[PDB]
Amino acid sequence: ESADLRALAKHLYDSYIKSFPLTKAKARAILTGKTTDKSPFVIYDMNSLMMGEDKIKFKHITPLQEQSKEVAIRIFQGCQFRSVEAVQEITEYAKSIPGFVNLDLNDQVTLLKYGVHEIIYTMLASLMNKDGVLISEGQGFMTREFLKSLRKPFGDFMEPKFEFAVKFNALELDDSDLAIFIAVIILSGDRPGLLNVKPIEDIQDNLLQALELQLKLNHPESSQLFAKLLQKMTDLRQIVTEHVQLLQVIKKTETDMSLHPLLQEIYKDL
Amino acid sequence: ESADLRALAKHLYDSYIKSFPLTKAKARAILTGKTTDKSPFVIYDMNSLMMGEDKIKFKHITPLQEQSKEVAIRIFQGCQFRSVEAVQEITEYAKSIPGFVNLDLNDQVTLLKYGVHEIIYTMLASLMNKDGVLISEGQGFMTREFLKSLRKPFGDFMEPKFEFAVKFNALELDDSDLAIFIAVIILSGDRPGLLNVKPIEDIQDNLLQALELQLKLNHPESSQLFAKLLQKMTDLRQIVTEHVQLLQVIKKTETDMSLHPLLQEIYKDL
Numbered sequence: 001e002s003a004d005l006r007a008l009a010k011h012l013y014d015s016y017i018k019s020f021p022l023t024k025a026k027a028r029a030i031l032t033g034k035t036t037d038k039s040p041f042v043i044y045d046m047n048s049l050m051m052g053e054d055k056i057k058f059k060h061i062t063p064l065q066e067q068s069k070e071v072a073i074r075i076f077q078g079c080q081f082r083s084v085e086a087v088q089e090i091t092e093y094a095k096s097i098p099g100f101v102n103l104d105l106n107d108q109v110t111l112l113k114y115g116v117h118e119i120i121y122t123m124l125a126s127l128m129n130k131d132g133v134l135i136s137e138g139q140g141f142m143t144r145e146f147l148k149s150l151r152k153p154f155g156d157f158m159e160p161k162f163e164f165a166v167k168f169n170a171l172e173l174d175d176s177d178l179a180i181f182i183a184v185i186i187l188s189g190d191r192p193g194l195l196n197v198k199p200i201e202d203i204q205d206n207l208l209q210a211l212e213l214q215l216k217l218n219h220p221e222s223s224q225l226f227a228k229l230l231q232k233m234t235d236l237r238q239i240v241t242e243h244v245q246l247l248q249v250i251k252k253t254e255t256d257m258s259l260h261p262l263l264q265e266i267y268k269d270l
Numbered sequence: 271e272s273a274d275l276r277a278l279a280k281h282l283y284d285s286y287i288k289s290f291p292l293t294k295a296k297a298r299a300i301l302t303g304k305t306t307d308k309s310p311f312v313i314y315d316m317n318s319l320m321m322g323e324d325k326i327k328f329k330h331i332t333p334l335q336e337q338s339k340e341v342a343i344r345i346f347q348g349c350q351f352r353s354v355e356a357v358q359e360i361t362e363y364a365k366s367i368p369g370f371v372n373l374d375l376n377d378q379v380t381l382l383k384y385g386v387h388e389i390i391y392t393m394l395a396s397l398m399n400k401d402g403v404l405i406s407e408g409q410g411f412m413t414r415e416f417l418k419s420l421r422k423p424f425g426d427f428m429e430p431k432f433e434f435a436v437k438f439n440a441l442e443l444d445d446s447d448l449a450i451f452i453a454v455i456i457l458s459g460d461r462p463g464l465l466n467v468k469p470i471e472d473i474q475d476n477l478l479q480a481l482e483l484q485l486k487l488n489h490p491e492s493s494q495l496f497a498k499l500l501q502k503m504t505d506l507r508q509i510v511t512e513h514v515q516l517l518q519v520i521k522k523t524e525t526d527m528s529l530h531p532l533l534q535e536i537y538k539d540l
């Protein structure tokens with residue numbers, strides 16, 4: 001019954017709203033300078049970065065950065081905190097997925113270890129547009145150009161994600177769609193190490209069904225959106241990979257720079 | 271109209287059969303399957319290979335192992351020769367795909383240049399099982415053991431494809447399913463350098479629809495099989511990347527040789 005599938009969509013959509021403070025709807029509402037209720041402060045250079053500390057909630061350094069944690073390291077450390085944040089959010093979204101907490105405890109850890117980054121870059125797209133990305137729950141907006149002008153290594157950490165976002169956002173999905181897609185990503189089953197795969201695949205087939213109906217119902221005039229979204233999973237993979245291999249480089253040119261335990265745990269080479 | 275999709279499906283199946291000598295149906299009957307009336311020559315050891323590359327129908331180098339050439343090199347170069355043949359076979363099939371020959375010639379070349387490796391490992395799985403792979407038009411069988419026993423660089427070369435095949439073959443697709451899937455792969459759209467993506471994606475959409483109806487009719491009890499197959503496109507991509515990787519590492523082994531100027535020429539990088 002497609003009725004049980006619509007119900008599962010509803011359930012997932014509901015938990016998505018409850019687990020993630022900044023949805024795509026709010027984000028787009030902020031990105032389109034129409035809704036002038038509360039606009040973001042823009043960062044496109046050092047000075048504005050300086051001013052941003054005063055206009056937004058920046059606990060980082062405001063003045064000079066060269067001889068005191070340069071701008072690049074600062075932005076990276078702050079971007080790191082938000083990442084560990086997204087995990088607790090995603091980790092909380094996950095438990096709401098029917099059957100996920102009933103699975104083997106170990107596999108739960110593996111599904112989260114391998115799905116967290118893919119989900120972070122999927123949701124990160126909701127906060128991007130060809131020109132930049134929202135920061136601090138939408139109070140700010142950092143320029144794609146500014147981020148790309150950072151020190152040699154930190155300069156291209158974000159470029160491949162903007163490239164994903166522009167094409168992924170062309171699909172025009174909304175939160176109710178993203179909620180089912182995020183659930184499909186977690187319940188993979190082809191993750192390295194899973195002890196029991198069948199119980200995970202039975203759940204994902206279920207999710208895949210819900211996503212299929214949801215897309216045809218919500219995007220009737222979009223031929224093959226279902227297939228087109230799934231192929232986006234290949235793009236997410238490559239992003240995680242380049243990110244990881246970029247970290248190994250930094251980890252060697254910035255012996256004084258520290259990574260967070262959680263994130264450091266999740267990451268694994270090869 | 272579902273009358274078109276079934277037509278395109280049969281048409282692709284027809285070209286597929288005429289373009290590829292060894293089909294999955296045949297290969298399967300030769301493998302684990304019984305259908306014993308002409309069993310293959312199992313190469314399980316160094317002597318099995320030596321005392322076999324002289325009685326099997328191969329075209330490259332004769333078996334010689336005594337301070338002259340390396341067994342690992344000949345096997346590698348052997349797979350390169352066959353793959354070169356494969357590429358011609360795939361190129362012919364592509365031209366039989368409705369709309370392909372009408373695309374900008376530059377994009378046709380581009381699509382083939384990047385789709386060929388993905389297609390090769392897909393069909394490669396048709397000849398594999400968890401224990402080995404069929405060789406030489408199906409006249410031989412090189413075990414998974416003998417391959418992972420090879421030199422340091424050449425020992426972890428085939429292991430990943432075996433792993434992909436084990437999971438890919440679980441899908442139990444058949445030649446009629448594969449014919450369409452292979453087309454979908456060719457008519458990608460996100461390949462770098464394309465000049466006119468619209469027509470390419472238009473064709474892939476029609477191909478996707480055909481694949482979807484095919485799986486629904488051919489595998490009624492295989493739920494969400496369409497989605498699962500599309501997911502495998504991530505596995506293939508990673509397989510292709512990882513491969514070009516070890517390949518570069520191989521280049522840091524054998525190089526300067528004034529005897530390969532014209533033979534080496536034949537094997538550019540794909």
Ligand SMILES: O=C(O)[C@@H](Cc1ccccc1)Oc1ccc(-c2ccccc2)cc1
Pocket residue numbers: 075078079082083120124133134135136137
């Ligand atoms: O405040 C936010 O949510 C910003 C990140 C940020 C946070 C504080 C200061 C500067 C930037 O948006 C993000 C940008 C990039 C990332 C991110 C996460 C993982 C890997 C790469 C980038 C996460 C959030």
